[PDB]
Tab-separated table of C-alpha atoms in Angstrom:
chain	number	residue	atom	x	y	z
A	156	UNK	CA	6.735	-41.163	-21.285
A	157	UNK	CA	4.360	-38.384	-21.426
A	158	UNK	CA	2.085	-40.104	-18.844
A	159	UNK	CA	4.189	-42.658	-16.855
A	160	UNK	CA	7.621	-41.305	-16.311
A	161	UNK	CA	8.664	-37.788	-15.087
A	162	UNK	CA	11.824	-35.554	-14.917
A	163	UNK	CA	13.475	-32.688	-13.096
A	164	UNK	CA	13.671	-29.009	-13.774
A	165	UNK	CA	16.455	-26.436	-13.193
A	166	UNK	CA	15.394	-23.774	-15.748
A	167	UNK	CA	18.315	-21.416	-14.938
A	168	UNK	CA	21.523	-21.595	-16.534
A	169	UNK	CA	23.473	-18.803	-18.202
A	170	UNK	CA	27.237	-19.500	-17.443
A	171	UNK	CA	28.998	-16.561	-19.341
A	172	UNK	CA	32.160	-15.273	-17.494
A	173	UNK	CA	32.843	-12.281	-19.623
A	174	UNK	CA	29.038	-11.380	-19.608
A	175	UNK	CA	28.663	-11.819	-15.946
A	176	UNK	CA	31.748	-9.519	-15.121
A	177	UNK	CA	30.420	-7.048	-17.583
A	178	UNK	CA	27.143	-7.044	-15.910
A	179	UNK	CA	28.929	-6.610	-12.527
A	180	UNK	CA	30.997	-3.777	-13.693
A	181	UNK	CA	27.970	-2.242	-15.376
A	182	UNK	CA	26.241	-2.367	-12.059
A	183	UNK	CA	29.125	-0.843	-10.453
A	184	UNK	CA	29.108	1.902	-12.800
A	185	UNK	CA	25.344	2.509	-12.191
A	186	UNK	CA	25.890	2.676	-8.445
A	187	UNK	CA	28.698	5.170	-9.135
A	188	UNK	CA	26.492	7.397	-11.384
A	189	UNK	CA	23.534	7.036	-9.118
A	190	UNK	CA	25.289	8.163	-5.973
A	191	UNK	CA	27.003	10.924	-8.005
A	192	UNK	CA	23.666	12.323	-9.221
A	193	UNK	CA	22.325	11.863	-5.644
A	194	UNK	CA	24.931	13.947	-3.743
A	195	UNK	CA	25.399	16.095	-6.884
A	196	UNK	CA	21.981	17.512	-6.565
A	197	UNK	CA	21.970	17.357	-2.704
A	198	UNK	CA	24.682	19.334	-1.396
A	199	UNK	CA	26.812	22.281	-2.112
A	200	UNK	CA	27.236	22.610	-5.798
A	201	UNK	CA	29.519	24.495	-8.167
A	202	UNK	CA	29.272	23.388	-11.786
A	203	UNK	CA	31.579	23.412	-15.006
A	204	UNK	CA	29.466	25.575	-17.275
A	205	UNK	CA	26.914	27.950	-15.848
A	206	UNK	CA	24.084	26.119	-14.177
A	207	UNK	CA	24.847	22.593	-14.950
B	217	UNK	CA	31.597	-4.008	-2.083
B	218	UNK	CA	31.477	-0.556	-0.164
B	219	UNK	CA	29.220	1.591	-2.100
B	220	UNK	CA	26.389	-0.770	-1.624
B	221	UNK	CA	26.040	-0.078	2.108
B	222	UNK	CA	26.992	3.548	1.616
B	223	UNK	CA	23.919	3.872	-0.657
B	224	UNK	CA	21.914	1.733	1.884
B	225	UNK	CA	22.846	3.821	4.816
B	226	UNK	CA	22.033	7.099	3.073
B	227	UNK	CA	18.758	5.803	1.716
B	228	UNK	CA	17.577	4.604	5.175
B	229	UNK	CA	18.630	7.863	6.788
B	230	UNK	CA	16.646	9.682	4.163
B	231	UNK	CA	13.845	7.187	5.100
B	232	UNK	CA	13.999	7.961	8.756
B	233	UNK	CA	14.934	11.549	8.529
B	234	UNK	CA	12.181	14.122	8.001
B	235	UNK	CA	14.046	16.383	5.419
B	236	UNK	CA	10.983	16.769	3.239
B	237	UNK	CA	13.045	17.965	0.137
B	238	UNK	CA	15.345	14.988	0.698
B	239	UNK	CA	12.325	12.785	1.361
B	240	UNK	CA	10.785	13.633	-2.128
B	241	UNK	CA	14.061	13.338	-3.902
B	242	UNK	CA	14.844	10.042	-2.392
B	243	UNK	CA	11.568	8.977	-3.333
B	244	UNK	CA	11.879	10.104	-6.941
B	245	UNK	CA	15.335	8.675	-6.835
B	246	UNK	CA	13.913	5.069	-6.056
B	247	UNK	CA	11.282	5.717	-8.738
B	248	UNK	CA	14.014	6.607	-11.224
B	249	UNK	CA	16.769	3.937	-10.586
B	250	UNK	CA	17.682	1.877	-13.657
B	251	UNK	CA	18.978	-1.443	-12.417
B	252	UNK	CA	18.751	-0.923	-8.547
B	253	UNK	CA	18.434	-4.409	-7.357
B	254	UNK	CA	20.423	-7.030	-5.188
B	255	UNK	CA	19.777	-4.498	-2.357
B	256	UNK	CA	16.060	-5.189	-2.746
B	257	UNK	CA	16.262	-8.112	-0.280
B	258	UNK	CA	17.846	-6.006	2.351
B	259	UNK	CA	15.490	-3.214	1.400
B	260	UNK	CA	12.383	-5.340	1.634
B	261	UNK	CA	13.779	-6.854	5.017
B	262	UNK	CA	14.299	-3.500	6.425
B	263	UNK	CA	10.806	-2.584	5.240
B	264	UNK	CA	9.152	-5.583	7.071
B	265	UNK	CA	11.170	-5.338	10.186
B	266	UNK	CA	10.456	-1.544	10.334
B	267	UNK	CA	6.774	-2.309	9.809
B	268	UNK	CA	6.928	-4.615	12.887
B	269	UNK	CA	8.826	-2.075	14.980
B	270	UNK	CA	6.460	0.741	13.970
B	271	UNK	CA	3.430	-1.328	14.817
B	272	UNK	CA	4.983	-1.804	18.275
B	273	UNK	CA	6.008	1.818	18.470
B	274	UNK	CA	2.762	3.379	16.805
B	275	UNK	CA	4.676	6.152	14.758
B	276	UNK	CA	2.307	7.060	11.953
B	277	UNK	CA	5.087	9.171	10.255
B	278	UNK	CA	7.339	6.302	9.732
B	279	UNK	CA	4.539	4.179	8.577
B	280	UNK	CA	3.668	6.706	5.713
B	281	UNK	CA	7.319	6.871	5.002
B	282	UNK	CA	7.395	3.156	4.521
B	283	UNK	CA	4.227	3.351	2.356
B	284	UNK	CA	5.778	5.962	0.213
B	285	UNK	CA	8.822	3.605	0.114
B	286	UNK	CA	6.626	0.719	-1.209
B	287	UNK	CA	5.059	3.173	-3.783
B	288	UNK	CA	8.543	4.188	-4.934
B	289	UNK	CA	9.257	0.432	-5.318
B	290	UNK	CA	6.088	0.172	-7.330
B	291	UNK	CA	6.923	2.985	-9.847
B	292	UNK	CA	9.965	1.242	-11.395
B	293	UNK	CA	9.513	-0.406	-14.812
B	294	UNK	CA	12.725	-2.367	-14.259
B	295	UNK	CA	12.197	-3.994	-10.779
B	296	UNK	CA	10.879	-7.672	-11.217
B	297	UNK	CA	9.609	-7.554	-7.724
B	298	UNK	CA	7.939	-10.936	-7.926
B	299	UNK	CA	10.010	-13.291	-5.679
B	300	UNK	CA	10.069	-10.667	-2.949
B	301	UNK	CA	6.288	-9.873	-2.949
B	302	UNK	CA	5.923	-12.446	-0.119
B	303	UNK	CA	7.652	-9.935	2.147
B	304	UNK	CA	5.614	-6.939	0.904
B	305	UNK	CA	2.193	-8.488	1.361
B	306	UNK	CA	2.639	-8.761	5.234
B	307	UNK	CA	4.521	-5.519	5.588
B	308	UNK	CA	1.707	-3.440	4.035
B	309	UNK	CA	-1.263	-5.584	5.344
B	310	UNK	CA	0.139	-5.501	9.013
B	311	UNK	CA	-0.315	-1.814	8.472
B	312	UNK	CA	-3.966	-2.302	7.714
B	313	UNK	CA	-4.679	-4.152	10.958
B	314	UNK	CA	-3.141	-2.558	14.118
B	315	UNK	CA	-5.054	-2.346	17.227
B	316	UNK	CA	-5.825	1.365	17.655
B	317	UNK	CA	-2.904	1.792	19.975
B	318	UNK	CA	-2.226	5.381	18.861
B	319	UNK	CA	-4.163	8.630	19.716
B	320	UNK	CA	-7.699	8.860	18.186
B	321	UNK	CA	-8.679	11.658	15.624
B	322	UNK	CA	-5.909	12.635	13.252
B	323	UNK	CA	-4.530	9.139	13.310
B	324	UNK	CA	-8.106	8.158	11.998
B	325	UNK	CA	-7.188	10.414	9.272
B	326	UNK	CA	-4.137	8.554	8.999
B	327	UNK	CA	-6.105	5.262	8.686
B	328	UNK	CA	-7.591	6.921	5.704
B	329	UNK	CA	-3.905	7.328	4.451
B	330	UNK	CA	-3.814	3.570	5.255
B	331	UNK	CA	-6.681	3.305	2.722
B	332	UNK	CA	-4.227	4.978	0.377
B	333	UNK	CA	-1.909	2.111	1.483
B	334	UNK	CA	-4.877	-0.073	0.400
B	335	UNK	CA	-4.801	1.685	-3.024
B	336	UNK	CA	-1.084	0.349	-2.970
B	337	UNK	CA	-2.652	-3.217	-2.183
B	338	UNK	CA	-4.823	-2.655	-5.331
B	339	UNK	CA	-1.664	-1.872	-7.347
B	340	UNK	CA	0.061	-4.911	-6.108
B	341	UNK	CA	-3.160	-6.930	-7.014
B	342	UNK	CA	-3.020	-5.373	-10.528
B	343	UNK	CA	0.633	-6.213	-11.194
B	344	UNK	CA	1.209	-9.478	-9.371
B	345	UNK	CA	-1.927	-11.899	-10.022
B	346	UNK	CA	0.294	-13.737	-12.737
B	347	UNK	CA	0.908	-16.683	-10.076
B	348	UNK	CA	-0.900	-20.033	-10.048
B	349	UNK	CA	-3.582	-18.045	-8.863
B	350	UNK	CA	-3.092	-17.403	-5.259
B	351	UNK	CA	-2.583	-13.799	-4.500
B	352	UNK	CA	-6.092	-12.309	-4.998
B	353	UNK	CA	-7.604	-15.410	-3.562
B	354	UNK	CA	-5.610	-15.032	-0.423
B	355	UNK	CA	-6.174	-11.302	-0.081
B	356	UNK	CA	-9.937	-11.692	-0.453
B	357	UNK	CA	-10.124	-14.667	2.017
B	358	UNK	CA	-8.218	-12.552	4.603
B	359	UNK	CA	-10.569	-9.562	3.969
B	360	UNK	CA	-13.566	-11.714	4.158
B	361	UNK	CA	-12.374	-13.268	7.504
B	362	UNK	CA	-11.931	-9.728	8.648
B	363	UNK	CA	-15.104	-8.268	7.306
B	364	UNK	CA	-17.681	-11.092	8.277
B	365	UNK	CA	-16.959	-12.002	12.041
B	366	UNK	CA	-17.730	-10.134	15.148
B	367	UNK	CA	-15.067	-9.196	17.748
B	368	UNK	CA	-13.419	-7.141	15.138
B	369	UNK	CA	-12.385	-3.644	15.924
B	370	UNK	CA	-13.079	-0.662	13.793
B	371	UNK	CA	-9.600	-0.509	12.642
B	372	UNK	CA	-9.864	-4.154	11.129
B	373	UNK	CA	-13.309	-3.509	9.755
B	374	UNK	CA	-12.110	-0.164	8.422
B	375	UNK	CA	-9.076	-1.615	6.611
B	376	UNK	CA	-10.958	-4.601	5.124
B	377	UNK	CA	-13.767	-2.332	3.815
B	378	UNK	CA	-10.955	-0.036	2.419
B	379	UNK	CA	-9.065	-2.865	0.668
B	380	UNK	CA	-12.273	-4.281	-0.737
B	381	UNK	CA	-13.101	-0.830	-1.891
B	382	UNK	CA	-9.567	-0.602	-3.672
B	383	UNK	CA	-10.035	-4.021	-5.323
B	384	UNK	CA	-12.535	-2.562	-7.503
B	385	UNK	CA	-16.123	-2.953	-9.109
B	386	UNK	CA	-17.396	-6.392	-8.766
B	387	UNK	CA	-15.848	-6.713	-5.206
B	388	UNK	CA	-18.109	-3.987	-4.084
B	389	UNK	CA	-20.915	-5.539	-6.390
B	390	UNK	CA	-20.751	-9.172	-5.051
B	391	UNK	CA	-19.032	-9.018	-1.588
B	392	UNK	CA	-20.194	-5.949	0.090
B	393	UNK	CA	-23.746	-5.974	-1.183
B	394	UNK	CA	-25.180	-8.970	0.963
B	395	UNK	CA	-24.253	-7.957	4.454
B	396	UNK	CA	-24.155	-4.225	3.743
B	397	UNK	CA	-27.512	-4.020	5.605
B	398	UNK	CA	-26.304	-6.140	8.636
B	399	UNK	CA	-23.316	-4.033	9.051
B	400	UNK	CA	-25.399	-0.921	8.746
B	401	UNK	CA	-27.359	-2.290	11.664
B	402	UNK	CA	-24.134	-2.703	13.451
B	403	UNK	CA	-23.447	0.998	13.088
B	404	UNK	CA	-27.034	1.733	13.934
B	405	UNK	CA	-26.183	-0.205	17.249
B	406	UNK	CA	-23.123	2.002	17.706
B	407	UNK	CA	-25.486	4.980	16.790
B	408	UNK	CA	-28.422	6.050	19.048
B	409	UNK	CA	-27.245	4.199	22.272
B	410	UNK	CA	-23.971	4.837	24.164
B	411	UNK	CA	-22.227	8.294	23.989
B	412	UNK	CA	-18.643	8.000	25.413
B	413	UNK	CA	-17.029	5.789	22.855
B	414	UNK	CA	-15.908	8.317	20.447
B	415	UNK	CA	-13.121	6.413	18.946
B	416	UNK	CA	-15.656	3.896	17.766
B	417	UNK	CA	-18.282	6.610	16.936
B	418	UNK	CA	-15.873	8.599	14.513
B	419	UNK	CA	-14.705	5.283	13.272
B	420	UNK	CA	-17.987	4.163	12.301
B	421	UNK	CA	-18.714	7.655	10.854
B	422	UNK	CA	-15.920	7.504	8.308
B	423	UNK	CA	-16.783	3.774	7.813
B	424	UNK	CA	-20.131	5.234	6.674
B	425	UNK	CA	-18.143	7.611	4.524
B	426	UNK	CA	-16.205	4.797	2.744
B	427	UNK	CA	-19.373	2.633	2.264
B	428	UNK	CA	-21.507	5.576	0.890
B	429	UNK	CA	-18.865	7.313	-1.247
B	430	UNK	CA	-17.466	4.094	-2.661
B	431	UNK	CA	-20.572	1.844	-3.123
B	432	UNK	CA	-22.652	4.701	-4.716
B	433	UNK	CA	-21.488	4.250	-8.408
B	434	UNK	CA	-22.043	0.451	-8.398
B	435	UNK	CA	-25.629	0.844	-7.304
B	436	UNK	CA	-25.986	3.751	-9.703
B	437	UNK	CA	-24.922	1.304	-12.474
B	438	UNK	CA	-27.081	-1.563	-11.375
B	439	UNK	CA	-30.087	-0.024	-9.737
B	440	UNK	CA	-32.013	2.665	-11.770
B	441	UNK	CA	-32.237	6.057	-10.057
B	442	UNK	CA	-35.844	6.554	-9.492
B	443	UNK	CA	-37.432	5.613	-6.214
B	444	UNK	CA	-34.808	6.969	-3.617
B	445	UNK	CA	-36.867	6.041	-0.519
B	446	UNK	CA	-37.506	2.494	-2.041
B	447	UNK	CA	-33.681	2.363	-2.692
B	448	UNK	CA	-33.151	3.246	1.033
B	449	UNK	CA	-35.932	0.498	1.963
B	450	UNK	CA	-33.886	-1.932	-0.305
B	451	UNK	CA	-30.549	-0.931	1.260
B	452	UNK	CA	-31.533	-0.464	4.992
B	453	UNK	CA	-32.605	3.139	5.389
B	454	UNK	CA	-29.395	4.939	6.278
B	455	UNK	CA	-27.682	4.885	2.893
B	456	UNK	CA	-30.719	6.633	1.321
B	457	UNK	CA	-31.311	9.250	-0.006
B	458	UNK	CA	-27.485	10.046	0.337
B	459	UNK	CA	-27.048	6.865	-1.754
B	460	UNK	CA	-29.442	8.254	-4.364
B	461	UNK	CA	-27.792	11.715	-4.149
B	462	UNK	CA	-24.342	10.404	-4.644
B	463	UNK	CA	-25.579	8.550	-7.456
B	464	UNK	CA	-27.010	11.657	-9.088
B	465	UNK	CA	-23.595	13.281	-8.508
B	466	UNK	CA	-21.963	10.234	-10.161
B	467	UNK	CA	-24.292	10.522	-13.073
B	468	UNK	CA	-23.579	14.265	-13.319
B	469	UNK	CA	-19.788	13.380	-13.271
B	470	UNK	CA	-20.330	10.808	-16.001
B	471	UNK	CA	-22.283	13.260	-18.006
B	472	UNK	CA	-19.640	15.935	-17.494
B	473	UNK	CA	-17.573	14.532	-20.235
């Protein structure tokens, strides 16, 4: 069958529900912290300690 | 959700707005984002369509903004950029073509900034030739068809010579070397004859600058540095003895270590 016949390729399955929504919530947390740092260092700033 | 398009709106308004501190901070932001994808299709689509619009509108500042945007896309060790490279290869290289529809002098210096965009093309060729080998072959065939033929403006010849300059050592050794002399005779036809085509004159002048100060070290490696006038006779006169002088400067820079 290595020479005559053939097959078909998909090459992408994970199917892990809890892992998928962990990845989605981690990406949401990353977007939160990224925009947090962005407009944290962008605009008018008052800190918690001195010069955070 | 909602924060995706908020980040997209603010990052495109930082891309268009000329706040220079916010410019550099957004570039370092894109360079330092862990896990910033799924916006990358809309990011690259905005890049390609903004390249088309800025080719139509001839705004060099938005062009260098988009090239720094591509540079910031390059400097992330997390972005598997592979599947979207087919959108970045036109969007950069359409910038390395366009038909001199701007103003002349300082935009010729901005064509040198598009040679820095050809350095970006060199970084793409360094990081993405792992395909069933197509990318470097496609870019070298495109640069060859730009470089060889006549009816090619100085923007196209300039960008082709700049891209083949950025591709590296044996590109200059094997592809520029044979018809170096014929394009030198083309510039000699631009020289010594008519006067009032100064776009083409200054274009051929810094074409000569690229040719000299990038083809000097490969001839310094191959050809031995006696016989400066014989090296000029072997390389159509006009390169020598500035070819041998820049070869001596490259030997001094190599011996500087």
